[PDB]
């Protein structure tokens, strides 16, 4: 039997991302548009800071800015929580701790609005050093990849995840971002609660030479594995 959720992702699906952020009192907004093809675990998106200059580094927002587009191997289809929650969707919450610096707290709703998959996010950042690697824009812009370790949260009918991102500092060194994640379904319907597994995630960051606004072009591959 094929779920309504699974069926929604068999072709190319348009994506819309909307983020409202406040880090150390610096307010900003980001809009993103693109396409996802879950059959190949493939995402292509362009993000624009709609408020001017982004007050934090683009690479620090990649994880916040749609794990429903992961390629789940057929033998792991019973563990795909993210698609099982669709179209009504899920809430995704995180705390992201930047080592020796501040933290982000995020809350997002990921759901269909018509035929478009929407990720609407609120982000709050506190305790950042004004001359630190984040507010000082000292991180490299190129590539972000890691494994996302997923476990069921039976009590909340959802999942938890934890993972680390290593951001290269431009003049040398590494800035660690420790991620803690919880996802809960929006609807009351049945969902798939997975066994322990991970998502292998790789993203390439680029620029559009015709784009004068502060922006990020992203190519991403996400694949579930045992
Ligand atoms: Cl940046």
From Swiss-Prot:
Sections of the chain in a coiled coil: none
Stated consequence of mutating residue 169 to L: In R10-3; matures to the red-emitting state with excitation and emission maxima at 555 and 585 nm, respectively
Pfam families (alphabetical): GFP
Tissues showing expression: Photocytes.
Recorded consequence of changing residue 66 to L: In EYFP; leads to yellow fluorescence, folds faster and more efficiently at 37 degrees Celsius and has superior solubility and brightness
Gene3D superfamilies tied to this protein: Green fluorescent protein
Biotechnology: Green fluorescent protein has been engineered to produce a vast number of variously colored mutants, fusion proteins, and biosensors. Further generation of mutants led to more stable proteins (at 37 degrees Celsius for example) with brighter fluorescence and longer fluorescence lifetimes.
Subunit structure: Monomer.
Protein's name in the database: Green fluorescent protein
Gene field: GFP
